[PDB]
Subunit: 101 residues, 5 copies
């Protein structure tokens, strides 16, 4: 029943108005926030929980770590030592001696 001329103008004028305006979001519906919680927020909570588990290892601005024990090592240098016991020895060569008695 609306004339074609009016119907044409209505569609064109309504599209022009919709595009001229800007849209202020309200609080979303519960259906949107449920979706968004699954798509984003719950995943952020899991990421934050995992990060926290790692950061609880930080003490005094150092990350506490654990290594196998005892830790296998190779000493690469010549070490100065102090011998604490009397040592049993086997003399292997013929020794020059000065008799003092």
């Amino acid at each position: 029943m609306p004339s074609e001329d009016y119907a044409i103008w209505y569609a064109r004028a309504t599209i022009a108005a919709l595009q001229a305006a800007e849209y202020r979001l309200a609080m979303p519906s519960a259906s949107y926030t449920a979706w968004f919680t699954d798509a984003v927020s719950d995943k952020l909570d899991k990421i934050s929980e995992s990060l926290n588990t790692l950061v609880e290892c930080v003490i005094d601005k150092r990350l506490a770590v654990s290594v196998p024990e005892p830790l296998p090592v190779r000493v690469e240098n010549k070490v100065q030592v102090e011998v604490e016991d009397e040592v049993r020895v086997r003399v292997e060569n013929k020794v020059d001696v000065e008799v003092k008695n």
Copy 2:
């Protein structure tokens, strides 16, 4: 088509209405959610999956680490040592002796 005065009224009144309202989002379309899943949610899953792998290394607030085995070390101090075996020796000097015979 309606008069210019009517068209001007309609454009202004409709824009005014669109901007006076606030908009409550519903569940998005399947097309929007598929796009958003690729743009955001799937990437959050990969981030969470990578963090999970790191956090599996944590036990009692210490991060388990691995170093080369065996680890090359350099001993910096003078070490007290206890010699446990008999030692073969070569006497390099002429020795003063007292004969107890």
Copy 3:
């Protein structure tokens, strides 16, 4: 009511107009921004803060770590040593001697 023909036209024309337009978001309302900050922004702050605690441990492109100390180690190689002080010894064998006087 208006005509059933007019009503069908109006539904089709209005949906077609709404779907032909594109929608420019303004700054959201206070209701939305409060929800969004709780759903996203505050969780990002929490993540950022935890990460900063970890990254504070990084010094000049190395992560500072703490290991139990003194660390138990097991030395796997034969170590060169230097004996600095006089060692007390006990000769275990009969020594061949050349008397020089």
Copy 4:
């Protein structure tokens, strides 16, 4: 040229209908997705890629690390040792001997 009553009604009724409806988002325009990619998705990619570089270091639930080598250490205890070579010695004292 609508009547004033109609103009007043149309403003109030249109606001009411807009507030009562809920709005289903379609696939966004290319302009929106281009902007959103810059604002969000590209930064998520950078974050994910940085995390992967760190997580490649994880081997069987341990983080592979590197320390300066050789690692400087201080031995805190007295060490039992086994001498494995013949030792050149210089005798310092006058030795008591029993002949043959």
Copy 5:
């Protein structure tokens, strides 16, 4: 001014059209992008910046770490050593000798 029957039909029909349609987002207003930059993007940037600092420590698929130097260790095993210098010794016992002259 319209009749109540029209007014009621218009409200019901317009809500029905608004809910039957779906909405294609254009590029958002400057107001929106400025708010969104503060609420999300700038926080992502800080997260990425902090993560970059940690990942700079990765070299050849290992994380570079620092421990206190020198690190205190406890040697748990008996160590084989090679003495490298001449050793001054004091003979503590009476030595049996075979005179070879």
